[PDB]
Amino acid sequence: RYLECASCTSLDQSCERGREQSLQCRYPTEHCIEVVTLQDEDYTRGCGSLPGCPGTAGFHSNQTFHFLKCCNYTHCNGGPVLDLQSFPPNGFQCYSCEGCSSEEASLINCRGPMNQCLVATGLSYTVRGCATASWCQGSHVADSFPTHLNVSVSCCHGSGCNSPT
Numbered sequence: 001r002y003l004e005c006a007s008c009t010s011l012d013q014s015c016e017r018g019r020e021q022s023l024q025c026r027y028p029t030e031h032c033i034e035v036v037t038l039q040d041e042d043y044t045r046g047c048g049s050l051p052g053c054p055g056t057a058g059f060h061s062n063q064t065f066h067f068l069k070c071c072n073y074t075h076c077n078g079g080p081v082l083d084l085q086s087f088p089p090n091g092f093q094c095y096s097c098e099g100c101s102s103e104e105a106s107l108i109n110c111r112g113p114m115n116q117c118l119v120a121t122g123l124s125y126t127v128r129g130c131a132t133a134s135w136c137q138g139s140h141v142a143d144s145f146p147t148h149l150n151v152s153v154s155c156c157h158g159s160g161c162n163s164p165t
């Protein structure tokens with residue numbers, strides 16, 4: 001039948017404050033979705049379809065945080081608003097830079113499910129940080145890159161394994 005999802009948008013203050021709003025989605029074609037990007041601060045909750053649902057995907061560096069979640073139960077995408085600090089450190093560290101070389105790259109402490117060290121380059125921006133595997137292997141890195149460049153990703157598991165060589 002229908003799936004009832006939380007609904008809000010950062011155009012409004014609906015994410016950042018208020019009673020939680022509902023929206024009907026067409027399941028199984030659609031699911032509850034929650035998309036976060038903070039550098040700027042874009043936040044949305046509603047209906048959508050991500051391949052790999054239910055699940056989450058995420059990436060953070062020193063100055064950017066992306067997170068996505070998809071799920072299939074009532075208001076599963078609701079609750080308190082997320083930021084990077086909602087996620088307890090997971091024990092790993094990765095090098096970080098924005099779109100960068102060995103002459104600067106600082107380690108950050110990885111949080112939540114973002115336990116892979118990432119390097120990605122777009123044909124020329126380069127980014128490094130902490131990522132989930134689903135972020136490494138999806139189309140998510142191609143998105144969140146300026147315009148329509150050629151994207152290659154490399155991820156590894158192990159603290160600091162994405163160091164600039």
Ligand SMILES: *[C@@H]1O[C@H](CO)[C@@H](O)[C@H](O)[C@H]1NC(C)=O
Binds near residue numbers: 062096106107108
């Ligand atoms: C985080 O980034 C800021 C730049 O806005 C920088 O001043 C700071 O040293 C960085 N710290 C870490 C731990 O990455």
